[PDB]
Amino acid sequence: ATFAQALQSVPETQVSILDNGLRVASEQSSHATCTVGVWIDAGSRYETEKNNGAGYFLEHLAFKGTKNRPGNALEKEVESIGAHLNAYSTREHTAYLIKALSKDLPKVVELLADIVQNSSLEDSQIEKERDVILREMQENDASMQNVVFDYLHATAFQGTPLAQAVEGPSENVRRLSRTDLTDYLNRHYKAPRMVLAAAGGVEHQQLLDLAQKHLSSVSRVYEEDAVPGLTPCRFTGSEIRHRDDALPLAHVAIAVEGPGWANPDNVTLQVANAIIGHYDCTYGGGVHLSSPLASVAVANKLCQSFQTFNISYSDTGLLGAHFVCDAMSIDDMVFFLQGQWMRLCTSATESEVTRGKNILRNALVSHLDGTTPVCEDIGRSLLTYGRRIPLAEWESRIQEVDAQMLRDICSKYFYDQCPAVAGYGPIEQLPDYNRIRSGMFWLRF
Amino acid sequence: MTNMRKTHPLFKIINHSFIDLPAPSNISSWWNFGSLLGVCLMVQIITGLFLAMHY
Amino acid sequence: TNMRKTHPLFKIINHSFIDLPAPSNISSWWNFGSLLGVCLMVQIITGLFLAMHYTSDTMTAFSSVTHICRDVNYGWLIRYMHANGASMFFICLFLHVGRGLYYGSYTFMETWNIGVLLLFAVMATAFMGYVLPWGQMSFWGATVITNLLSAIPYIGTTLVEWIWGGFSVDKATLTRFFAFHFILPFIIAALAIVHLLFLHETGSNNPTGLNSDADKIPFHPYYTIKDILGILIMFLILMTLVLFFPDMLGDPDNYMPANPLNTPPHIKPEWYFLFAYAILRSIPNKLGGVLALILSILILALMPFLHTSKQRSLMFRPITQILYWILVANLLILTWIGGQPVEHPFIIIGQLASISYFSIILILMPISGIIEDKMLKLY
Amino acid sequence: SPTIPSRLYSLLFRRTSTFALTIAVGALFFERAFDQGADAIYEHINEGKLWKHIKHKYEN
Amino acid sequence: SSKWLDGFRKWYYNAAGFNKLGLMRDDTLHETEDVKEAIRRLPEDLYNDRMFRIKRALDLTMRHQILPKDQWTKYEEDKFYLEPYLKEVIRERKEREEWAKK
Amino acid sequence: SHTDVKVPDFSDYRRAEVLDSTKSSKESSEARKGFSYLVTATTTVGVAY
Amino acid sequence: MLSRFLGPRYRELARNWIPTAGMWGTVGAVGLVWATDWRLILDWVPYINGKFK
Ligand SMILES: CCCCCCCCCCCCCCCCCC(=O)OC[C@H](COP(=O)(O)OCCN)OC(=O)CCCCCCCCCCCCCCCCC
Ligand code: HEM
Ligand code: HEM
Ligand code: HEM
Ligand code: HEM
């Protein structure tokens, strides 16, 4: 069987629209377990720096009780069937998802009926979640990777709603009140911004009947009739450097502005990342990895680990690399990393393009294994693209990438650009911004 | 692959002295005079070399 | 605490001459390298004491040199040790390059290339210094070799008018040659510093060619007193060559004043150029002769890419030893032929000598290396 | 419309080899223009005094 | 090949002269990356024997002496200890080079 | 807190075309690079002359 | 291409880098005729020929 018709044998996601504008999408497979979730366009980018932690505080409180099921009884409704109830919030998308069995498919929709509609916010829960979130961020600032990524968003998107963290500053956490959470729920938990996704052993018609009978009362109507626009954000080439020499080793991330979701050359950028890839100190290949950055990083013992990311948002994003290493090699890692980017702008040959295409194909198919990743892709794709892209379309878009358009796209996005730098730890040998800006181009080109 | 700036020996010497030399950030215009003395010494060598061709 | 390892100026001297690891089995040939440095200092020092009385003017250059010999206190001593020290400098230089060729020392490619740059610089310095006393042979040798340097079409005539500073060799050429001859040994000294710096990253070679890291000794006190003994032997040879035969290597025709209308019956350079001269006139085409001189001196630069054996030294290669000694014999024959006039049978001997020289360096030594590799059952 | 510095960056200043070619050709044209202009300023400030202004009475 | 080539090999082994310093053939090989890796892959016994033979040869060439004739390395007893390691290193380098070609 | 930090106001220093925070970049970056590299190219031309 | 640079990949590197090397050679030739004031090639252009070098 050829890969194309094997990819065509995957069942298609079925999408339908209620009269509220809420989208309902399902994908059917042969599993005995299903994953049902609600995806809302309500992140930290929709906040106005006085409700900067409203989404995090709400997603803390969302499993603490409704106006019909008071508190822990809701927990029993999840725990007496073995379902796993989960939630997360990015800067743009907020998901409440749950994994259960198929026989419990109606009743569990009931939970997603009243999690996003009839949340009850008791005040004792408000101060309890207030100091829980305070010690949660006091725990989370120890993780240097989250600190570096939040610093990168702070220095890359200065003065924009996309710089602020999902959790927000500590002063708002001690300042969010009941009415502000009510206003956030009224403005952002509306009907046309919500996608009910299901993956696994579900049928689309039964899911539609349950979705109608439960979520037909979601608002669709505005409070003050003022549409919250999702404005463009100004990327700013800059640096931020937090020097703390007591830390054992440093985390450094360098990014440039990338296109987002709607631009198809994102797929080309993914192949570029698949040329450079990732490396960790606990790998197995050694010096014989195909990535030249990883091979030189294990040959000279430069870094503890590095990875490449392509983070996207509405018409914007970040595209770059993040490495943790000891201090004495930091600039050398930068030099080698920058050199790899310049090769992808100048000397891209078909062998590494074929290798990166194969890596992206295998990673893309193997990522969509499991009802929870399939439901995540359905909800995120209908929030971002407005439709679910079948994997055959992804295969057709991948197959059109050769070396010429790869180095064209990489010269567009990487060559002679102003990056955003975020360093944390013993970063004295991290070079000054003029050295990185000089490393963004070659004099031999 | 290596870095020819930090491994080649005379490139290592000029990298230590001229490229990756840690200098204070706040030194004023009075610190330009050492390089001025060096380049004026070089000007004296070159102009005297061309003067001694006919003297 | 100690100044030998912590003081930033004495640390360099300790790293280069005191606690430097050197092979324990290097022969006397290695002393030649230090001898070259000593000759450089000697030349510079003696050159400075010639410069306190030399007058760079075509009317008063020959007269100034005679005034140095006849009226300056011990001025004859300084002039003749400058001349015979140039000769001893070229002797030590030739044996240094022969040591580099025989014991496979050209695999230090950066050291070898800074070496051939040094060789070019000292050949030009000795040329302009020989022009400086402004005798018959100085004027006519300068005119001959610069006029044949002019052989390049559309470029060489403007270059020779620029070098001469006029229609032919005149006072401007003499003064600019004095300035260039004074200033070139300091670029030579700096290039020797870079030469030693490029050497010291990897250490010296040994006559066996093997890794001497199993047995190395400090430079002090062993090679200190060995190079002192070599300096004393060299000063014996040099002072015998000054105090007893002061013009055996010289040319008597340089003792007449430069008459521009008196073409000598023979025109020669000094002996250390003569072999290249015999490669120059071995081809009856001026572009071919000048370019063949350039290849005859730059085949040393081409030498590290003509190495084919899996061994390094010639100590265990008898056929390539035979080819090397045939090459040295051919070089001696080329020197004798360049001394000789352009008559029968010197023209055919010089042609066969240059052909065999280029054939031995270019073709025959890699063939001998691969033959010995096949002979030792490894290829 | 795209601006004049935008077209200059996208067409000439992006690569380094085109940057160097632009610098060389601009140096040629600029030495021609600058030498002619500075020379013309020099005879406009010193009219009737240079030899070129007075090589008409005696040149014949 | 039968009669005198082996005899000429014996005569050339005597004439080259590394046997009278106690060296084997593979001790005389000039180091490259391949030879250094092959030396690095040697076991401890052969490595120590090689390094002792090398420094004994350097001691002998210091004093401009040779070994006594009974201590000269015999042509038949000369073992080629290194060349399987060197051939394996050369083979894997050729594999890496031909992969880098395509 | 790592979320308590934010970049201070650079509106005294940044250029006029990048002053507006609600307008995306990559529309005027070519003009800024062209202006700065035009200054660099013109002083290189003068130094070469 | 001494012994082991012969392959499709180094052919692709050459096809990527000959345009850059050609542009650099154009830079070198223009700099040569600019600095040396060459009589053959600088006498074709209309602008520079006002001073006739
Ligand atoms: C098979 C040989 C047997 C020899 C036996 C000798 C007696 C043995 C018993 C007594 C012991 C004596 C001392 C032993 C010394 C070491 C061993 C030995 O004899 O080696 C022979 C020696 C080197 O051996 P190998 O390299 O194999 O010889 C190849 C020949 N080309 O090779 C030689 O000595 C031969 C050297 C010949 C060189 C001829 C050079 C002719 C060309 C010179 C041109 C010069 C330039 C001329 C001008 C050119 C332009 C016109
Ligand atoms: C021959 C002329 C001289 C040359 C070429 C020369 C060269 C230099 C250079 C290149 C520097 C480093 C750059 C700088 O700090 O300006 C320097 C610094 C210095 N020089 Fe000199 N120098 C000369 C004369 C002197 C003299 C006469 C003195 C002593 C009075 C002196 C004392 C110093 C000191 C103390 C510094 C360090 C100042 C600092 O670090 O702030 N120099 N010189
Ligand atoms: C090694 C390099 C140098 C050479 C070859 C050199 C050569 C000469 C020559 C030939 C002259 C005579 C020309 C004339 O006087 O009109 C001269 C004059 C002079 N030199 Fe130098 N010189 C050198 C370096 C210096 C330096 C470093 C200085 C000090 C800054 C210096 C100061 C002078 C002065 C003051 C004069 C007198 C100028 C005059 O009155 O005309 N020279 N030099
Ligand atoms: C200007 C004259 C020269 C000077 C002052 C000079 C100086 C030196 C010195 C001091 C050494 C270290 C001592 C030694 O090992 O002998 C040396 C070694 C060396 N030189 Fe030169 N050198 C000169 C010319 C050359 C030339 C012309 C060449 C190239 C043919 C050359 C190639 C080498 C090499 C290859 C070594 C390494 C010795 C070894 O490890 O076998 N030198 N030189
Ligand atoms: C900076 C150092 C040097 C100075 C100032 C210098 C200066 C002079 C002067 C003034 C003369 C002419 C006086 C005379 O001919 O007796 C001369 C001649 C000469 N120099 Fe030098 N010299 C220097 C270094 C050298 C070196 C390194 C060499 C060797 C390559 C050399 C080779 C000669 C030769 C061959 C002559 C001609 C000797 C003769 O009259 O036959 N000089 N030098």
DSSP string, A19-88: TTS-EEEEEE-S-SEEEEEEEES-SGGG--SSSTTHHHHHHHHTTS-BSSS-THHHHHHHHTTT-EEEEE
D-proximal residues of F, 8-47, CB under 8 Å = 30-35, 37-38, 41-42, 44-46
Domain count, chain C: 1
Q: Specify the residue with its C-alpha closest to ligand 4, atom 16.
A: C33
CB contact under 8 A, A347 and G20: no
Which residues, other chains included, contact A11 with Cβ-Cβ below 8 Å and sequence gap of 6+? A27, A28, A29
Name the residue ranges covered by the structural domains of chain G: 1-53
The edge-to-edge listing of strands for the beta sheet with A420-425 is A239-243, A420-425, A250-258, A316-325, A305-313, A278-280
Cα C131 → chain centroid: 17
Distance C50 CA to ligand 4 centre (A): 28
Residue A74's identity, in one-letter code, is: L
CB contact under 8 A, G27 and D17: yes
Range(s) of the domain holding residue A322: 238-440
Q: Is B24 in the pocket of ligand 2 (CB under 6 A)?
A: no
Annotated binding site of C for a ubiquinone: 200
Range(s) of the domain holding residue D44: 1-60
Look at residues A215, A250, A269 and tell me which one is the last residue of a structural domain: A215
**After which residues does chain F break, using C–N > 2.5 Å?**
none
Contact B11, C197 (CB under 8 A): no
Identify the residues whose C-beta falls under 6 Å from ligand 5: C 43-44, 47-48, 50-51, 54, 65, 79, 82-83, 86, 89, 122, 125-126, 129-130, 132-133, 181-182, 185
Distance B11 CA to ligand 4 centre (A): 21
Burial of A176 (0-12, 13-18, 19+ CB in 10 A): buried
Q: Rg of chain C's alpha carbons, rounded to an integer?
A: 23
Domain count, chain D: 1
Distance C47 CA to ligand 5 centre (A): 6
Distance A136 CA to ligand 1 centre (A): 89
Residue-by-residue DSSP string for B2-55: --HHHHSHHHHHHIIIIIS----TT--GGGGHHHHHHHHHHHHHHHHHHHTTT-
Tell me the resolution in Å. 3.3
Contact A266, A406 (CB under 8 A): no
Q: Specify the residue with its C-alpha closest to ligand 1, atom 47.
A: C330
Q: Helices C318-339 and E5-16 sit at what angle, rounded to 10 degrees?
A: 70
Question: The tokens of C301 are what?
Answer: 């630069």
Same-domain check for residues A106 and A182: yes
Q: What are phi and psi of A23, to 5 degrees?
A: -95, 140
C27 Cα to chain E: minimum distance (Å): 8
Residue C340: other Cβ atoms inside 10 A: 17
- Would A222 be classed as within a structural domain? no
**Per-residue three-class SS string for chain G:** CCCCCCCHHHHHHHHHHHHHHHHHHHHHHHHHHHHHCCCCCCCCCCCHHHCCC
Q: Which ligand is nearest to the CA of C312?
A: 4
Task: Please identify every residue of C annotated as catalytic.
Answer: 200, 204, 226-227, 270
Range(s) of the domain holding residue C219: 1-379
Same-domain check for residues A191 and A306: no
Q: Kind of pairing, strands A239-243 and A420-425? A: parallel
Q: What are phi and psi of A67, to 5 degrees?
A: -85, -10
Residue C247: other Cβ atoms inside 10 A: 12
Distance of CA A211 to CAs A83, A196, A377, A382, Å?
Answer: 19, 8, 20, 17
Distance of CA A232 to CAs A44, A258, A316, C296, D19, Å?
Answer: 15, 13, 8, 70, 33
Q: Which ligand is nearest to the CA of C320?
A: 1
Domain count, chain A: 2
Strands (E), C150-284: 216-218
Instruction: Name the method of structure determination.
Output: cryo-EM
User: From CA A308, how far away is CA C205, in angstroms rounded?
Assistant: 47
Q: Is D23 on the interface with F (CB under 8 A)?
A: yes
Helix, strand, coil fractions of chain E, as percent rounded to 5: 65, 0, 35
Listed in sequence order, the DSSP H helices in C206-317 are: 222-243, 274-280, 286-302
Residue G25's identity, in one-letter code, is: G
Mutate to test the interface with D, among F36, F37, F39 (most CBs of D within 10 A): F37
Annotated binding site of C: 82, 96, 181, 195, 200
Q: Kind of pairing, strands A84-89 and A94-101? A: antiparallel
CB contact under 8 A, D18 and G23: yes
- Would A56 be classed as within a structural domain? yes
Burial of E74 (0-12, 13-18, 19+ CB in 10 A): exposed
Contact C306, C241 (CB under 8 A): no
What is the residue whose two structure tokens read 């300042």? A175
Contact C295, C357 (CB under 8 A): no
Contact E57, E21 (CB under 8 A): yes
User: From CA C33, how far away is CA C36, in angstroms rounded?
Assistant: 5
Strands (E), chain C: 21-23, 216-218
Would you say the C-alpha torsion A60, A61, A64, A69 has a positive or negative sign? negative
Q: Is F26 on the interface with A (CB under 8 A)?
A: yes
Reported as half-sphere exposure (CB side, CA atoms, 13 A), residue C252 has a value of 1
Distance of CA C338 to CAs C332, C341, C350, Å?
Answer: 10, 8, 8
Question: The tokens of A248 are what?
Answer: 């054992």
Smallest Cα–Cα separation from E38: which of E73, E95, E90, E97?
E90
Smallest Cα–Cα separation from C123: which of C103, C99, C101, C97?
C97
Question: The tokens of G45 are what?
Answer: 């252009």
Of G26, G50, G51, the CB nearest to D21: G26
DSSP H/E element including A310: strand A305-313
Same-domain check for residues A432 and A312: yes
- Would A385 be classed as within a structural domain? yes
Q: Kind of pairing, strands A305-313 and A278-280? A: antiparallel
Q: What are phi and psi of A181, to 5 degrees?
A: -65, -35
Question: The tokens of A415 are what?
Answer: 């060559």
Q: Is E5 in the pocket of ligand 1 (CB under 6 A)?
A: no
Question: The tokens of C306 are what?
Answer: 């003509």
G10 Cα to chain E: minimum distance (Å): 7
Task: Please identify every residue of A annotated as catalytic.
Answer: 59
Smallest Cα–Cα separation from C266: which of C123, C120, C144?
C144
